[PDB]
């Protein structure tokens, strides 16, 4: 339902620039705009809202060129951190606000509102004012207000920041359940790759104002298109190695390098913490020495320092929470990896 | 090096109250004060700093009663979000600030500063001003300034908020490496249980101004002292069940209940997402129906809805990323659990 055609919006300061972007978001899809602060992800969200206008290129929604139409003129609803519930209005009135302008007759406006309130578990709070509710409940009300008018597109601008970690997690699960229910098209901004993998159908990875990759969680995690995607999605150990005899040396192992990479050129080897296995050994021949471990529930995190001074992060099964002690010497076993040209 | 003795500081509004707390933090230990917003965790950090004073009880540091001593009078350094590097001073001068007041002669102040700068990889930035550095580098400078005077205690008040997820993670790994190096005693505030498990030696779980538990990451995760600890550390599915015939029914399984829990009383069953196994089945006898799955790298997250309408979150191995499709019917297998009295 959304499309950017060679959209460009450059800021002389760098951050926030969008550098000639094009993509197509499917109807009913939930897309996460994932990137570093100032990578262009927020500008893109704002370009879809109409809060910003492209210097070149166009924005389409529902096959409808809306590049020059204001926010009010687009079929999109906003759930922004920039927002604020009407503090002196009850939950009921905050939510009816949108229907209030579509000239919907009283009876139908009412049924629409009651509909949204029960769906979102806010019936017991209809006659309450925003200050009487928890932040969590206030976000449910904001999503109800945005949805009332039946928007075509739903835009989220990190509305859950300044929230406690646990409530933030319950919220994203709620927003997802609501999305699947309302069948709308949703786009959200985030600098947290875990959040993107968790709720998005597809992820748009942004970097320096360009789209690095646009794919499913599995796609961006298992088949990263660039070193940036490889290093920004999931966790990773990233190091430089020089190619010699068609291979690089990683932990006493020769990793073959694609023949298209020239002898003597440098590459980044990317190895995920879970993809490295540790086995006891003597300092004599050991690859690394354990700095320390941390039990994280589903797995134990183990940091080790190689002979060359590289500190690697390795994830071992919970069933090994007590296997590696500080100072201990160990052998490494890289099992999966990525290799990208520097 | 730190001890609270029946410390009490109550706020008429609830949030921030500390309700009769006592604990002992070991020398060279890194402790995480983990709790919901307003649970008393920040007030406690401030009580150690001297920024706040207890209404009752006392605070000890290094076996030294300091309850009535100001921040300046305590052997503690601050790395707060409330802070701000001196923008018009170079990195070198920002860091020498502390030594500057211990009347340390020029030569020795200089060697101390150069010492800290090289340790923290800020030598190439000595003659730069704060605005010339990334936020990440600015935090390294703040930690250097706090450490210059050789504080006994190091206090962190969520200094990494308003930071990108990836840099926040690199920062905590750095703060930990520094801590292990300087051998100081450190306390940090956090509402993120994952962060606490990752870097703390022991975690102080706060709730409504009381200490729920004080133990190692493994302790609080595997042996939660209360339902709150069980539901606040790690991930969990939490549901109520009534006891009948000395057991509760969870997914077609009878979980025995400790004989000390009376017939007819209600309990909370806590089951971690990773501790539930799914196997195909007919709707006829199936326990749940898959709402959806999300690939998260090391594991696939699967949400299912039971016949009774409970939506459970289950974590299945990456090796099963494509095994469960929406609508699909399934059988559940709870393998580990906790049971606490409601
Ligand atoms: Cl941006
Ligand atoms: Cl607090």
Residues B158, B79: Cα–Cα separation, whole Å: 9
Under a CB-based contact definition with an 8 Å cutoff, are residues A222 and A229 in contact? no
Residue numbers of the domain that contains A293:
285-333
CATH code of A340's domain: 2.40.50.300
Residues B254 and B217 placed together within one structural domain of the fold: no
Residues B268, A120: Cα–Cα separation, whole Å: 24
A298 Cα to chain B: minimum distance (Å): 7
Q: Which of B179, B213, B237 is the last residue of a domain?
A: B237
| Other CB atoms within 10 Å distance of the CB of residue A103 | 7
CATH code of B308's domain: 2.40.50.140
CB contact under 8 A, B36 and A301: no
> Would residue A218 count as lying in a domain?
yes
CA A73-A119-A194 angle, 5° bins: 75
Under a CB-based contact definition with an 8 Å cutoff, are residues A54 and A43 in contact? no
Residue A246: name the closest of A222, A275, A267 by CA.
A267
Residues B333, B120: Cα–Cα separation, whole Å: 49
> Would residue A215 count as lying in a domain?
yes
The tokens for A186 are: 């949703």
CA A16-A19-A22 angle, 5° bins: 115
Q: Which of B237, B262, B295 is the last residue of a domain?
A: B237
The tokens for A75 are: 């079929």
Residues A140 and A180 placed together within one structural domain of the fold: yes
> Would residue B279 count as lying in a domain?
no
H/E stretch holding A160 reads none
Residues B138, B325: Cα–Cα separation, whole Å: 47
> Would residue A279 count as lying in a domain?
no
The tokens for A203 are: 């992820």
A99 Cα to chain B: minimum distance (Å): 30
A245 Cα to chain B: minimum distance (Å): 32
Nearest-CB residue to A321 (from B36, B165, B218) = B218
Under a CB-based contact definition with an 8 Å cutoff, are residues A185 and A153 in contact? yes
| Other CB atoms within 10 Å distance of the CB of residue A168 | 20
Q: What is the DSSP letter of B260?
A: T
Residue A320: name the closest of A305, A301, A336 by CA.
A301
* Torsion over CA: A310, A313, A317, A321 (sign): positive
Residues B184 and B202 placed together within one structural domain of the fold: yes
Percent helix, strand, coil in chain A, to 5, is 30, 35, 40
Angstrom distances, CA of residue A178 to CA of A124, A134, B238, B288: 19, 19, 21, 20
> Would residue B220 count as lying in a domain?
yes
Contacts of B303 in chain A (CB under 8 A): 173
* Torsion over CA: A172, A173, A175, A179 (sign): positive
Residues A253, A306: Cα–Cα separation, whole Å: 14
Q: Which strands sit side by side in the sheet containing B266-271, from one edge to the other?
A: B237-242, B266-271, B338-341
Residues A242 and A209 placed together within one structural domain of the fold: no
> Would residue A159 count as lying in a domain?
yes
Residues B209 and B313 placed together within one structural domain of the fold: no
Residues A221 and A341 placed together within one structural domain of the fold: no
Residues B108 and B27 placed together within one structural domain of the fold: yes
Long-range contacts, stretch A102-108, CB < 8 angstroms, 24+ apart: A102/A149
Angstrom distances, CA of residue B65 to CA of A35, A299, B22, B61, B62: 49, 41, 14, 7, 8
Residues A159, B25: Cα–Cα separation, whole Å: 37
CA of B42 to the centre of ligand 2 (A): 4
Residues B117 and B261 placed together within one structural domain of the fold: no
| Other CB atoms within 10 Å distance of the CB of residue B137 | 18
Indicate which of A32, A34, A136, A165 best probes the interface with B, i.e. most B CBs within 10 Å of its own CB. Answer: A165
Contacts of B311 in chain A (CB under 8 A): 177
Can you name the residues that pair with B241 across neighbouring β-strands?
B267
* Residues shown for chain B: 342
CATH code of A6's domain: 3.40.50.300
Number of domains in chain B: 3
Torsion over CA of A61, A66, A71 and A76, rounded to 10 degrees? -10
Residues B304 and B265 placed together within one structural domain of the fold: no
Residues B56, B6: Cα–Cα separation, whole Å: 7
B28 φψ region: left (φ > 0), alpha (ψ -120 to 50), beta (else):
left
CA of A324 to the centre of ligand 1 (A): 42
Residues B6, A330: Cα–Cα separation, whole Å: 46
Q: Which of B237, B263, B294 is the last residue of a domain?
A: B237
Residues B65 and B200 placed together within one structural domain of the fold: yes
Residues B180 and B207 placed together within one structural domain of the fold: yes
Residue B156: name the closest of B136, B186, B184, B177 by CA.
B186
Under a CB-based contact definition with an 8 Å cutoff, are residues B204 and B33 in contact? yes
| Other CB atoms within 10 Å distance of the CB of residue A248 | 22
Under a CB-based contact definition with an 8 Å cutoff, are residues A268 and A339 in contact? yes
> Would residue A280 count as lying in a domain?
no
Residues B259 and B314 placed together within one structural domain of the fold: no
Contacts of B291 in chain A (CB under 8 A): 177, 180
Nearest-CB residue to A166 (from B232, B292, B301) = B232
């Amino acid at each position: 339902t959304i499309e950017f055609v060679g959209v460009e919006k450059i800021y002389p300061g760098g951050a926030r620039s969008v550098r000639g972007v094009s993509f197509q978001i499917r109807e009913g899809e939930m897309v996460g705009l994932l990137g570093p602060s100032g990578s262009g992800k927020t500008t893109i969200l704002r370009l879809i809202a109409g809060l910003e206008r492209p210097t070149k290129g166009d924005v389409w929604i529902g096959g409808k060129r809306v590049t020059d139409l204001p926010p009010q003129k687009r079929n999109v609803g906003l759930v922004f951190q920039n927002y604020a519930l009407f503090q002196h209005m009850t939950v009921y009135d905050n939510v009816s606000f949108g229907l209030r302008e579509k000239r919907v007759p009283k009876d139908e406006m009412d049924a629409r509102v009651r509909e949204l309130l029960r769906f979102m578990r806010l019936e017991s709070y209809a006659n309450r004012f925003p200050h009487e509710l928890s932040g969590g409940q206030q976000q449910r009300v904001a999503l109800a207000r945005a949805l009332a008018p039946r928007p075509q597109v739903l835009l989220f601008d990190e509305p859950f920041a300044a929230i406690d970690t646990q409530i933030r997690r319950e919220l994203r699960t709620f927003v997802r359940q609501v999305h699947d229910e309302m069948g709308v098209t949703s786009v959200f901004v985030t600098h947290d790759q875990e959040e993107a993998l968790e709720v998005a159908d597809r992820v748009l990875v942004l970097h320096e104002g360009n789209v690095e990759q646009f794919g499913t969680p599995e796609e961006v995690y298992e088949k990263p298109g660039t070193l940036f995607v490889a290093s920004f999605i999931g966790e990773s150990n990233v190091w430089t190695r020089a190619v010699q005899n068609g291979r690089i040396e990683v932990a006493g192992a020769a990793l073959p390098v694609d023949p298209a990479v020239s002898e003597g050129s440098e590459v980044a080897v990317v190895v995920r913490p879970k993809d490295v296995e540790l086995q006891p050994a003597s300092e004599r021949e050991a690859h690394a020495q354990v700095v320390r471990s941390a039990f994280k529930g589903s797995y134990s995190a183990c940091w080790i320092r190689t002979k060359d001074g590289e500190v690697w992060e390795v994830h071992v099964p919970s069933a090994d929470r007590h296997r590696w002690s500080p100072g201990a010497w160990v052998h490494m076993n890289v099992t999966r990896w990525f290799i990208f040209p520097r």
